[PDB]
Each structure stands twice: as structure tokens, then as C-alpha cells.
Subunit: 485 residues, 4 copies
């Protein structure tokens, strides 16, 4: 069996917190309540003075992605181990289909790579990086049979992944038809391409050139544009890696205006800023390079945390896409060649707790919402995950909100040899991680086998995403004026 | 016993909706799950094609209030009956303590009046309409022993209930000390007093004078002021009856800015507008008169519903404070003498469903949040109410979202002889109402006895309200700069 | 000679108003001051109780444009006559170069058509409707030798005039190089194309389909996008025909943010709204059809006037592009075939005075700014026009602000057989119009000859437009961080 | 006579810039034009490579004010000398009438003190620090006979100058009746009083306590409140010393909304920030203390300059109210006793040029608007001052925009022994200052006699301020609905 009783702790769900024990049997939570009996043989995890929360769900990872010449060093095995050590029990990774390549082939290739390696549960989003009848069919198959209800489109990466407004319109229309959510990388790829060309011609080859060629206006513009096209076809939209105040404000305004759109800041944009691109040490600066870039306005991470607290922004991922110091160095003379991507999978939970809960910006319940529950709602497996309740999956973290840990590449479990949060002292430590009903992390040690985690198959038409869309299809149809001919 | 099994319906909570039966025994929900056994003797309510939702909680009523010369016609008995017929199973009414009068006496007087009459559960807020050592002591007693964690302060009603900024500061400080929430009637009472004097001198004695003397700037101003004072003392704030776009925007901005404040639109401001004050029929116009007034900008109710959907605004009441046609007529020659107050207790649920869910602005789950769950969270009895779950109170409504009912003073159960929503066709009908585990409304008929309802005693420091306040007390203390003398 | 002395009136300039006579000799104002001597032979125009203002400058006309199959009925001759009768003494018309056609040929063709016909002064903007080395050269020639410092680009009209973001970037870059201002028609042409296709498939063929296929989000999106690209290249930008609140707000925000951008509402969007597209009479509805469309939110024209008063919006034109009732009827069965364009050249001045000055939104001086002075500043001939002062051109209107005139296609001087402002009672009447130092309109009668007006040759680098751009070129250059290799 | 010909320079007015000489005779500009003849005897000031601009007008000074126990060290003599040396040729100083004291007596006392000492022209605003029939009469006399059209009211300084909302309403009403503009010190005096009491009890006695007791919310709140009351009585309003982003945004929103209100940032809030209150050196920190305080958000001065460039904010003063290092030291142990006030009169022009024009935020013409022209328009002597034109007063500065000067208490002409802009390198130097047609400053040396300057008597109903107010009185009267009784 493996029975666990988590005793003495305070359960924290998105709605409220309460003292109760949690009885885990066979991969599931089978009872939640005060003073539960320890069945003979069951292991007791003593959660006295700890919070018992749903494991974190990272909506946004790229484990071992082949990108910009080289492949990310955190792979599905190490990446999921590092996740677990940081209190994160599921990741959602992007199938980065190449232009002209079958989405089903790319999906198959990702499942073959990840299935034997993941140490925690996971699922996949599929990038739609070109358009045709075939992609159209494949999206339906993915949504109805392969357990994927999220497709990722790019407005940046000109020549590589970018789609133009007419194609986004079509793609978004078909997302709505198959009951998928549309995710977008929202930056203006034409401005980025011109921008970088210009920074290089001016001899600005360092990482400050990377930020200067695509300042936050370029992100805010494409964010509004994506929302507008999606609003025109009544397709639900998800803006991945919101990095800037102005893009966050676009999302905030559109939601207030009743648009079905969700904004996802990431640990990087919540925990540090882009002043690091101006560091005198080139290696240090390059560590932070990713698209969109972190912003040189120091008030950014605090502001994004305030909007995350208030639900202008709704949930978090990390965009974990790591490259070692010697891989980043590929762009020593030209920032367009630094492989883009930062760490976060392991530290997300502590970073958000320290910058969001300890700071007084959000409460512990909103913390659960924005680290697991909302991901489960949008991507369609709530309350199977994201809630401590009978019948839910036993993905559970015992959390110490009072003790601190200092984040350091010297003690972290990620494969990357630096950490963008190097030195940060965070309140909020994952003391014990349970995944699929097994203790996989405790006393600073991991106990898990590659392949122990499972792919989570999801159904389309997630209710949290589609119930308003469908009611608007029914009452928001345009009408003709009846006239004499 | 009275056992009820509600079978075949779809349960709708704030987080998600799911098919399940609900077993009610002894005033409580004792089981929720699929295909439950009907125990011998238990009555089955067939909820096939219906939603099974928590009963509505009206945060804002004034049943039989003696006000402006006369007393409201809907009393605790008829008012709670009408509530039940409209799908609302709890009301929170205001103890309107007079200036210089003991808050404990006023509280006692309200409990004596309401206890033998209420047909559904209820609780009370207490108005703090003057300030002194005695009021200070009485507030502590109310909060610690009398089950009241909400105190109501007025920035309008000059000469009558109004408090100045220094007194609000003190009052708000002491609310924070006793773990109460501060509610405010946010209009500038000095502008209202000057405004009305001016409208009368210009011979504008009709109800249009009532709105013109205190247009929405006057509400927005006092709303910002209340938020600022409350932010200065770190006291949680609740703005009652938000009537206008601009005041709603103040609340929306303050929350985005991380201020602990909640905004409560009411059915009136969600379901109609203030163009009615300009109606050629004086009686018709006077029906809508209340403070703050409904606004002549027709886009108002739709905008307030959009902000309620997005959580800029968080929950709803009705400010039910009804006066018959012949009572309103007291101000035939002078709008300052029309007793202020409109209906809503009965129609709130259908009005919000039609204007909010049927319109596609919010989903059924957000509907439960803004009609019961959030009230229970703020006023500190969740999930005892506001949730369909084992151990919760059996206050449950079987709801038909597809059928319409037309609202009319001819068919309504309120004592008042008109209805501000006269003629409105609403999708969303309460077909069966269960209160304290008894069927009190079914087949258009009420079956309930005055006194059947119970006063709900609450504890202070509601966690949903105070967890951020307390963390800010711990990390947001101002520090001195250490200097050589 | 033709000497005129305008006596007894109050001169109104953009900065202030003052009593003075104005002495006109040889096409120029040669003296302004109190109690001027009447030289023997000079005609006195008695301006007692009248304002003496600079003639209106219409920044935005399409006289006799061949468009959507047919050509506008108001031609350079009738159009300029109608302008004069309405108090407007200069128009700036768009050379609508076709895709692949020489801009110089189109320019020559417009000068040949207009020179022998105009009855008042005029100048030209040139549309850049495709991109290449040749267009690049021609733009330089136009700017340096042909008196044109304004080029017009389209984000709408897919297949016809539309340019993509990379081309706008290049085009805007070259505008900056030649010291021109970039004008943009800011709507998303991909959304319009999809939108219309969809409205037709739903059998919405009436004019309401025209507005519904491109609601204001589509305008606001492209407006932000244009501003962003122009900000990226430091090119000054001008947004023509701002029709909606949301697009106006984009412009307002960008200016507050220090972006060099100007917004131009037109008489149509200041004086009426798009509810007319829903009129039961098809002919009536089609009268209002133009791109972007007038908006069905009735608060629009008032809001645009408030932003024009506050300088969020800076100056006005009419987009005068008129088609008779039988020409509009070309789209009786399909709104995509209604020739787009409304009237305004004649009524602009009275419409803006009535809706802006008489309403109390702006003063008479701001009225001069937004009807002549700012056009002269941006398009680079101030104070030669747009000011009553010694040495300025004698384009002068004697204006009665107190008397009303009702606008009617029955009394107007435009060739079109209807008027979108039909029935409007406007305070503010042009009683006498002086153009090039000659009385061309008085006692309701026109006295002017086709060809009397002159083309105004302008120089590039208008100081009002470029002084900030050039200082930013000097201090806003991006810098490299100096690092060890 | 004293004739001066200023030759070879570029004249810069609010509307445009142009090459011309300026002929000065007898205190007036008597001709402006190219290549003017030098009359025998006239002194030529060679303005080759210089701008010739209207002298600066400082709307906001307190020369030798007795305040908080002691009197400001810059008096009318030294203060006006320092003004002249900085390119400022007029100051408007506040008659600080004490509570219960005759406004006419205070006015007389200020004229007696200033008349024999001023070295440049000046005028006065009168503070209305209490309310009664007598103050009412005195305000009329001041406005009609004493040349004052601006009255200053306080929402801060509880116990000392503060007025409550009902009194502001009355005061603002009477300002409108006498054709005066209402100026307000907009901070919530009740919050300040509580705030400071709290900071002291926590042992925060340093200048950081001064800012922390009244953060920018306290300013923004009172700013909105003042605007609302003034909007209710249709009285034009002027918000003095706007110090914070949020208060500036209130003003910006109200103007966009068509409210007649003007915002005046000062040199301090445009040129430095409130991080200085946290300096380890107490003397340094105390130098910056004034009400409202400078703000610790470093983006503030840049943001205020952007809103000044865009006309959200309209004109500038300095609030010059200086106290020596040993006078500031009066509050060594208690920040409530540091005499409030900073320097600026001398450096305003260079500070604004460097931070506003050199930075690319505004052009030279907007610079003239916000340093002289708008003050002259609002306070009612334009174009007698604020314009280089025939008949205007010869208050003229020859300005070098290319050379820098470093500001230092070691080289400045103010009496105060420190400078809040210490060390700042500003482009933009006043090389020659002409006041009343005499060279009073050249080659770094002053040549002027105490009493040479004149008091400027103004008339009420300034047109720039009142033309919209009066039109709204005529068309914005509320109407009754006509009903059967
Ligand atoms: N961009 C980046 O740096 N991380 C992942 C690649 C992407 O999605 O943009
Ligand atoms: N105002 C009103 O009309 N209803 C209740 C009384 C109040 O709270 O203002
Ligand atoms: N569009 C329109 O209706 N008038 C002129 C053509 C254009 O510029 O769009
Ligand atoms: N406050 C200040 O520091 N300067 C002048 C006094 C005032 O007006 O507030
Ligand atoms: Zn991305
Ligand atoms: Zn990514
Ligand atoms: Zn109230
Ligand atoms: Zn109430
Ligand atoms: Zn156009
Ligand atoms: Zn046009
Ligand atoms: Zn002040
Ligand atoms: Zn002052």
C-alpha cells in the first residue's frame, strides 16, 4: 500500500485553512479530518507547526529543450527532482514543434523523452508554430485523444515560430472549436528583429543590448494585440511569462473589461529584475537573458506580485530553460547568440512565499491558488490536483513558513551552475514533499526514481475557462436590423 | 429528524461545479456524493436539471428600520419570508444606533425585535454613529461576546450619523484592535448638505434633485478618503452600497494597489439606474430614491456587474429598506423628505443571475462567490455557510437557471407595494429553498414560522480579512535611521 | 490693392483674445491694433459683436477621390467653396497613391486637378501605400522640393493600402530621416477583413455590419501598435480620424508618457455617433459609413470633445469624402460595397463651436488652436496661418458666437444630397470669410473663382514636431556597458 | 531713457521661436524684428547664440516668512536678487494671514515689507485661513481694489490654517463670486496630525519620520477632495506644490474630465527626491523637509516633469521658504519642529531646463509656457509679462542653453547656507537678466537696488481661468422635471 498519515499540521487550500490530519493511501488522499487514527503499518509525517498544502504546479517549463544551438541542462529527470526539492509536484512542459513539423510527432517525441525520466507528474502544452489543414487536424486529435487542452503560439521569433495576425485569428478560432486554451508568447517579433539589428550596429553586444532591443512597450503592444484578436473570435487566451508592468497592465485592463484572458508571471519576474543585464561581469549579466527580458525598472517584481495578489495576474510558472555558464558564453560577443532562458523550477515556491506572503502582499490561501489551484482549474484537473481533499491526488507538501533558506547554486538541485536568485533569503521551506502518495523529499534528501511520475491526460473545454465563452456564444450573437429592402 | 435528500442536481460551489446528491439531516449537510441512498422516511427533492447552490447571503438589510420619520414596511418576518422566496437564506442587518445612544442597547433592541420574527438565519452589523470611551468599550464587548465583527460608519448624514476624519481614524484604529471589519457609507456629507440646500433654492424639489445634489464625484471622493484613512491605520475596510462607476473605480484601484478593502454593489445598482429619478410620474421617480443615489449614466449597472465579475467588487447585498408609495409621498414637495431606500431582498438572486450569469459576465461559480461565499468569508462563518459540503449548514437553494420569471410587485412577497425591478424578465428561479435543513419554500409557496431562523454569533479576526493585515503589522513597521546625535 | 479694414471686432488667437481692428492689404494682415484709420478706398467690414479669428484649417480631406468604384461628389471646386461658406480657409488633402504607383506622379496628378479649381489655399499629404527604394527616393524629393512634410500610412485596407509592422518601421524610419511627420490610419486590417467576412456569412449586410466587423478595440489595438513602432524609431506620429474613446485613450496615455504623437478627431466623431448604423432606413444608416466607423456608444463624441479640450487630442479635420445617396446605394445588399466617407468640410467650425465652446468644454482660444493654429504648427506654416497678427496671411473669419444656424442638406453648399449633422442647431456662425485678403463669403453668398486659392509649399522638420525628437537623438542614444572581454 | 537693443538672438515665446532683435525703451519692449537699428546712446546686448526669453515668473514664494518659530533667511531683497541671478524676474508671494487676523492688515503688512526691498516685480496671493463675514468682505476688497485675484486655502496645518470641507465650500463659492482663483495646499491635516504623533511615539524623530507620517496617499486624497468641492461650486482651482505622482495623477484625471483645475509642481519636486530624508547625516536630511514632503520614489521628479511637459501640470514655482542650517537644527530631536521649507527661487530656471528641455521631455517653447506665460495667464497679466512682443514689459532673459553651470551653495546668491540641488550640473544658464527695461544681472554680477521692483496690480476674472466657468454658469444650470403636482 504505502499509507501515510500527515498529522498535526494546518491544511491550506485556496478557499480557507484549517487544522486537520490527512490520510494518504494508494496515491490518493482518502480522508481529511481532525485526529485521524494511525492504521497499523502507516508512516506518520509529523506536520506540527507546518502548513500542509497542495504541491506546486509549474505551468511553464522547457526541460532539456534543444534551442538556439544547444540543449537546456536541466532535463526531465534532474528538472523534476529539483522541482520536488522545491515543493513543486507537477510541471507542464512545452512541446516545441518546429515549423513544418507534425505536432503529433513532436508530442510523441516529448512523451518518449519524458515518460521514463519524470520523477513527478507532468503534462504538456503543444506549440502551434505554423498553420495548415494538417496542423488543424492534429490540434483536434491532440485535444480529443492526447490529453492536451493548451496550445502555444508565438508573436516573437520572426522566421522561426512567429505567426501573423491573420494566422493567429485562424489558430485562435480553431482553439475555441476544439475547447483548448490559446497561450501566447506576446512580443512584437518585427520590432525585436529590427531592434537587435540596431543594437549590434551600435556595438552594444552585451546583455544590456538584449533588453534595450525589446523594451516593455514591445511586450505590451503584442499582449494587447493578442487579447484583441482572441476577443474578436471569443477564444479564451493565456499570456505566458508576463515580465513587465505595462504588459501586466494590459492584461489587468482586459480582464476588468470582461475579456477571458489569464496572465502568468514567472518566478524570475517575481523575484529579480533586469538591472542585472547592466552588470560589469558579462557572465553574471548573461545568466538573466531570456525572452521577454527582465526589466530594468526595480519596481517591476513588486508590482507584478501586487497584481498576482489581486488576481489581475492569476497563476505562476518558471519558464525553466536552463543553460550552463559555458553554454551562455556562446553569445560572449553577440547577445543574439546567448541561449535564452533562466532557472526557477526549484525556487519558485520559496521565492513567491518570501516576496508575496511574507511581504504581506497575499495570504497563504491566495498562495495556494497562484502556485497550484488555478493551474489545475485552467488546464482541467481540479480538484484532482491543487486541493487537499478526499479523493484528490496525494501531491502534498509540508511547508515551514517561518524558517528561511538561502538560495544558492551551491546547495540547489538544478543542473545549472548558477542561480538568478543567488543569495536570496526566503521564508518558506518545503520540509517534506509527497508525490503520488510517496515521500520523495525529506531531510534535505531526495528519494525518487526516474519514471515514477505520470503524464496527466486532460479533457478539453475546461469549465473554469469555457463556461463564460459558451454563454457568450449563446447570448452575444450579432443581430441584423430588419429593414424594408 | 427531518432528513432530506436532494437528488439528481449539479452542486455549484465558489470553486467548481459537480454532479452529486446532498444528504441533509438535523440542520446540516451530512454527506455530498453521487447516488446516495434514500434513508427510510427521508424526503427526496428531485433536483434533476437544477443547480444546487448555497443559499444567498444578503450582507445589507434594514428590516423595519425607523428612519426619516416612518418605519420600513418590510419587517424581519415579511423581509425574511421574501428573502427565502427569492433564494436568500440569510440576511445581515444593521443596528442603527442613534448618536449618543449605547451600542449595546441598540444591539439588544435589534435582537429582541428580530429573534421572534426571522424566518431564516441572520446576523447583525453595528453602526458606530458617535465616539467616546464608552463606544470604545462597547465595540470590544460586541466583538468578543455578542457575535458582531463588523461596525458601520457614516461619512454622510451630517448632524445625524456623520463622523469627521479624526474620528474615523480613531474608530478605524479600534476596529483593527478588536479584529472587526470597518464598513463605511462613503459620501461627502458636507457636499450633500450644501448640495440639497442649493437644489431646493433653485426649485428642484423632485427626485432628480436628490441625485443632482450628490452626483457620483461626491461618492468617489469619500470612498478614496475612507480607504486612505483605513490604509493609514492598517484597518481592513468594507465600502457598502457602491452605486457609481467612479466609486467602483476607486475601490478597484485601491485593491490593485494592495489595500485591504472590499466593495459591495447592491441589487439596485446592479439591476437598474438613476434615469428613473427624471420620470414624469413623481411617484415612480421617488420609488428609486436612496443614498447614495442610483446614477443617470445607463452604463453604470453593466459596469458594476463587470467589476463584480472581475473581483474589483467582491460581494452583494440589497440595502433593502422599503417604504410604501404613501410613505415615499412624505416628500411630494421636497426630496429631502422622501424616506430613502429601495427593495431588493427578494429579487437579488434572480437579478444578479440574469444581469451577470445569463449575460455572460460571470460564471455560476463566481455567482455563488458573490451571493454567499464571500459574505461568509468576510463576516467569518465559512464554510459553515456559503458552501455545499459535509458539515456545513443546510441552507440550500435548488435553482433553475434556464426558466425565467418576471419580477412584479403583483407577484412578489415583499410588503412594499412597488418594485424597482418591475417588469424585469430574469433567467434564474429559486424553485426550492431549504433553510436550517427544512424546506421553507417550494411550488411558489412559503412554509415557515416567524422565529424559526437563528442569530449567527461570529468571532473577530476573520482570517480572510486579517491574515494580510497581521503579516503587515509584523513586517511593515516603520524604522528609524540610525544617526550620530 | 483690395484693402480691407475689419473694424470693431474682438481678435481671438490661440493664446488670448483682445479688441483690435485688423488692416488687410495685398493678401496679408499688415496691422493689428485699436482704432485703425480707414485708408481711402479700403472696404470696412464691421465686426462689431463678432469674433475675428484665423480661418479654419481642415487637416483631412479627400476632394473628388476615386475610391471603392466611384468618385466623391464634393470636388476641389465645390469642396473649397463649401469650406469657405463654413469658415474654413484651407484644406489639406491626401494624395492617395495606388500600390506600385509613383508618389511623384500621384502628387503631380493631384496638383493638376486642384490648382485650377481650389477657391481657398490648400496643401497635400502623400500616402505611402507600398515600400521600395523608389518610394524612399520619392519621399525625400517630396519633402525637400514639393512642399510636403506629411506622409500617410495605412494599417487597414488589406490587399489595397495596408503595410505590415516591418514595413511601417522602415517607412517611419525614413519619415524621420527626411523630417516628415508620419500619419497613420490605425485599424487592424486583418481583423477588419475577417470581421466583414464573418458579418456577411451571418447575413448581416446592413451598415450595422460595417461597425460590428471592426468595433473600437480594432482601432485601439492598431493605434497602440503604431505609437510603439514610431516610438522605437523616434519618429513623430499623427493618428488621423480618431473615432473612439478607447483609441483616444491610447493616444492620451502615450502623450502623457512623453511619446511624440498627435491625435486628430474629425467633425463626424465630434458631432454625431454610430447608433445611426442601426437606423431602420437603410439609406439613412449608409450615410454614416466610413472607416473607422462612428461608434454606437453615445458618450463617444462628448468624450472626444473633452480630450480635444484637454489636448489629449490636438487638432481637427473632417475626412470629407462625400458620396451621394445613389452612390452609397452601391452597397444596398453588402456593406463592404458602400463607398466609405462622410461630409464635414463645411460644418466643422460650427459643429465644434456648438459641441465644444457653447457646451463649456473648451474656451474660444482653444477653439482657434484646434481648428487652425495646431494644424499650422504641425504641418509647418505658423504663424503665416492660424494667427491674426501682422505679416500673417489674411485668411480671416468674422464669427458670430451667439446666433445659431441649423445645418441642413437643404441649405448647405456641399455637393452631397444629405448631411450627417442634418437638423443640428449650432451656435457659432461664419458671417464673413476672407481668403487671401479677399471677401469670398458674406451675406450668405459666395464670391470666389475656381483657382483663386494657392498650394502652400511647406518645409520639413517642423519645429513644433521635431525639436524634442532631435534633442532625444542627442541625449537618448543607448550606451554599452564597458566590460573586461 | 535707458534704451537697450538685444541683438542677434533667437526669441522664444510659448507658441514659437524666431530670430529677431528686441528693442527696449522705457521699461517696455517697443519693437521686435530682424536687424533693428541701434539708436544713438542705446546699449547693445549681443545675444548671438543665445535664446531671448521672457523672464521667469515664480508663482510660489515665502520671502522672510515668520513660520514655525523663526523667519526664512531669504528676504524680499536677497530673494529677488537671487531670483534675478537665476533668470527669474517676478515672484508671487503669499500673504500668510493668521487665523482671526484681518486679510487687509496682512496684505498691508506684506506690501510695506516688500515694496522698499524687491529688486524685481512681484505680486501677492492672500491666504484665507479662517472664515467669516469680515473675511468675505475683505476678499472682495482685495480682488476689486488691491490687485489680488488668488486666494490660498489650507487643508493641512490642523489648528493653525486648516479649513474643513464646509468652510472650503463657502470659501470656494466666494472666490468664484469675486472672480478669484482658489489655490489649495492639498494634504489631509487630520492624517498628518495623527501620523506625526504616531511616528514620534515610535521614536522616529528624524526627517524620515516627516515623510512617513504623511506619505503621498495623504496628498492625493486631499487633492481629489479639493477638486470635488471646487467642481461642485464651479470655482476654478489651483493646486500648489504638487509633490507626488499620485497627487499629480488626480490633477491629470480631473483635467481630462474637464474640471477647471491647474497643478503647480515646484523646482524641488522636479529636481530632487525624498530619499534624502533617509540620509545618515541629520543636517543633510533636514535640508529637504517641507510640506508636502518630497517622495522616496526616485521616479517621482521625472514623472512630474513628463506631466508638466504634457500639460497635466501647467506651471512652476519654488515654494522658496529658506532656513539656515542652524535654524533647521531647531528640530534636531523632533521633526515636527524642523522649520519646513526648501530653496529654489534662484535655480528653478536652470533646474527645469536641464531636467525638462535638455532631457528631451519638453521643447523650449513649453519651457517658456511653464516658467512664465501660464503664470501670467492665470494670475491675469499676459501678455504684459510672459511674452517677448511689442508693448510687453521688458522683463527679459538672455539664456545660454548649451553651457552648463554647477549649482552650489558656494556660488549661489541665496541667503541660505545649503542648496537642495547641491552639485547638480545644469545645461541652461541666465547670462543676462533685464528687469523693467534695465540690465540687473550680467557677467555673474548683480546691479540692482532694493525697491527698484514694482508690485503688479491684477484684475479679477482672468479670462484664461474664467471663460469656461462663465459659459458653464450659462448652459450647465440644473433643470426641474415638469410634473403634474
Ligand atoms: N525565452 C526564454 O528565454 N525561455 C524559453 C523560450 C521562450 O519561450 O521564449
Ligand atoms: N440610504 C438608503 O437609502 N438606504 C439605507 C439608509 C443608508 O444606509 O444610507
Ligand atoms: N474611410 C473613409 O471612410 N474616408 C476616407 C477613406 C479613408 O481614409 O479611410
Ligand atoms: N511647507 C513648506 O515647507 N513651505 C511653505 C509652507 C507651506 O505652504 O506649506
Ligand atoms: Zn516564451
Ligand atoms: Zn517559455
Ligand atoms: Zn448607507
Ligand atoms: Zn444601508
Ligand atoms: Zn483613413
Ligand atoms: Zn481620410
Ligand atoms: Zn503649502
Ligand atoms: Zn508654499
Amino acid at each position: 500500500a504505502g499509507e501515510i498519515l500527515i498529522k498535526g499540521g494546518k491544511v491550506v487550500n485556496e478557499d480557507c485553512s484549517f487544522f486537520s490530519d490527512v490520510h494518504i493511501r494508494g496515491g490518493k488522499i482518502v480522508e481529511v479530518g481532525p485526529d485521524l487514527r494511525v492504521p497499523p503499518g502507516a508512516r506518520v509525517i509529523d506536520a506540527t507547526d507546518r502548513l500542509v498544502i497542495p504541491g506546486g504546479i509549474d505551468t511553464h517549463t522547457h526541460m532539456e529543450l534543444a534551442f538556439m544551438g544547444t540543449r537546456a541542462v536541466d532535463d526531465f529527470h534532474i528538472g523534476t527532482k529539483a522541482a520536488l526539492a522545491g515543493g513543486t509536484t507537477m510541471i507542464l512542459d512545452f512541446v516545441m514543434t518546429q515549423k513544418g513539423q507534425s505536432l503529433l510527432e513532436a508530442y510523441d517525441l516529448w512523451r518518449k523523452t519524458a515518460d521514463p525520466k519524470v520523477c513527478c507528474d507532468y503534462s504538456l502544452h503543444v506549440a502551434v508554430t505554423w498553420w495548415s489543414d494538417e496542423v488543424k487536424d492534429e490540434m483536434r486529435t491532440l485535444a480529443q485523444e492526447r490529453g492536451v487542452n493548451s496550445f502555444k503560439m508565438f508573436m516573437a521569433y520572426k522566421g522561426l515560430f512567429m505567426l501573423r495576425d491573420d494566422e493567429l485569428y485562424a489558430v485562435f478560432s480553431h482553439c475555441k472549436e476544439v475547447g483548448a486554451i490559446a497561450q501566447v508568447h506576446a512580443e512584437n517579433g518585427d520590432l525585436i528583429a529590427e531592434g537587435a539589428k540596431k543594437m549590434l550596429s551600435l556595438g552594444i553586444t552585451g546583455p544590456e543590448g538584449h533588453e534595450l532591443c525589446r523594451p516593455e512597450a514591445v511586450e505590451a503592444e503584442a499582449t494587447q494585440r493578442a487579447i484583441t484578436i482572441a476577443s474578436a473570435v471569443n477564444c479564451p487566451l493565456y499570456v505566458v511569462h508576463v515580465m513587465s508592468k505595462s504588459a501586466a497592465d494590459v492584461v489587468s485592463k482586459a480582464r476588468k473589461d470582461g475579456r477571458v484572458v489569464f496572465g502568468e508571471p514567472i518566478a524570475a519576474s517575481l523575484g529579480t529584475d533586469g538591472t542585472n543585464y547592466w552588470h560589469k561581469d558579462w557572465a553574471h549579466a548573461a545568466q538573466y537573458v531570456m525572452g521577454p527580458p527582465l526589466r530594468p525598472d526595480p519596481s517591476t517584481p513588486g508590482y507584478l506580485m501586487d497584481l498576482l495578489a489581486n488576481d489581475d495576474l492569476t497563476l505562476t510558472g518558471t519558464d525553466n530553460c536552463t543553460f550552463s555558464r559555458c553554454q551562455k558564453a556562446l553569445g560572449k560577443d553577440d547577445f543574439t547568440r546567448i541561449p535564452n532562458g533562466v532557472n526557477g523550477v526549484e525556487d519558485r515556491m520559496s521565492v513567491i512565499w518570501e516576496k508575496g506572503v511574507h511581504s504581506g502582499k497575499m495570504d497563504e490561501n491566495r498562495f495556494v491558488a497562484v502556485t497550484s489551484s488555478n493551474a489545475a482549474k485552467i488546464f482541467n484537473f481540479y480538484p484532482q490536483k491543487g486541493r487537499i481533499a478526499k479523493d484528490s491526488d496525494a501531491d502534498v507538501v509540508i511547508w515551514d513558513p517561518k524558517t528561511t533558506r538561502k538560495i544558492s547554486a551551491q546547495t540547489h538541485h538544478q543542473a545549472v551552475d548558477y542561480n538568478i536568485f543567488e543569495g536570496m533569503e526566503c521564508h518558506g521551506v518545503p520540509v517534506v514533499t509527497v508525490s503520488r502518495g510517496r515521500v520523495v523529499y525529506e531531510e534535505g534528501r531526495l528519494k525518487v526514481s526516474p519514471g515514477q511520475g505520470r503524464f496527466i491526460h486532460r479533457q478539453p473545454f475546461s469549465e473554469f475557462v469555457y463556461k463564460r465563452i459558451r454563454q457568450r456564444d449563446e447570448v452575444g450573437k450579432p443581430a441584423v436590423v430588419i429593414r424594408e429592402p
